[PDB]
Design a protein around this ligand. Sequence first.
Ligand SMILES: Cn1cc(-c2c[nH]c(=O)c(N)c2)cn1
Length: 255
Amino acid sequence: QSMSVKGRIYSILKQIGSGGSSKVFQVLNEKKQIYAIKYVNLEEADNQTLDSYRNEIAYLNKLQQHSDKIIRLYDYEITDQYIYMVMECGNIDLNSWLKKKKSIDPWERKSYWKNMLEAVHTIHQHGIVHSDLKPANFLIVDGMLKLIDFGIANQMGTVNYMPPEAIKDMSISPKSDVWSLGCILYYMTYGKTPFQQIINQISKLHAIIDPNHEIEFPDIPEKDLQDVLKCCLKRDPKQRISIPELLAHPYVQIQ
Ligand SMILES: Cn1cc(-c2c[nH]c(=O)c(N)c2)cn1
């Protein structure tokens, strides 16, 4: 019902999420202000697992100064036992917002799409590739989208956003993140994932790999959006659109 971080006393409002070792809480400070505290319990965590959390914190602290589209981290407490991260509190996650919403206004969709490329572009500049991108790594705060996960540590489980190169890499580049964002935008346009209809997961993996499989892009009034979707969802990483290219596309730029 209460926890301390760097002397500061935060009273727990509710629990948002959990990822086994982790637990996220909606808390309030002394002045009734809202924050979200991530709690990690290192008691049973391994040497490799600890450096993944040590790495994610470092980047999440550095990269905060490089984009308003990356989740704010106000403070943190690290000991051998736990990790207390005091971050900004969002309205709702993108996955929950999309699963709820029936309609998606073109002006909102385009705005969110710009927020994502800005975050994803920031991380790529510091040599980070997320790889596992899903609407859950995004969070609506002050009507603006923000990146919570850098895909470094363990996230607090849909196969609908997997890049083809990843499935074929069983025997990862920035183009892997383009495919995944392409799938989040497609689902923001057509209401469903590109391979969301393929019930069997073994077969769903067969589809993403197979080039003789044609992905559907129904005729939309937003001409540029359909071209964005056709460029992001190119199976060959070499022939796929880049993040600096998407940022200079007519979809993002033309008003
Ligand atoms: C890195 N990380 C940020 C969060 C988080 C921060 N703020 C929130 O509002 C939320 N739902 C989640 C969880 N993990």
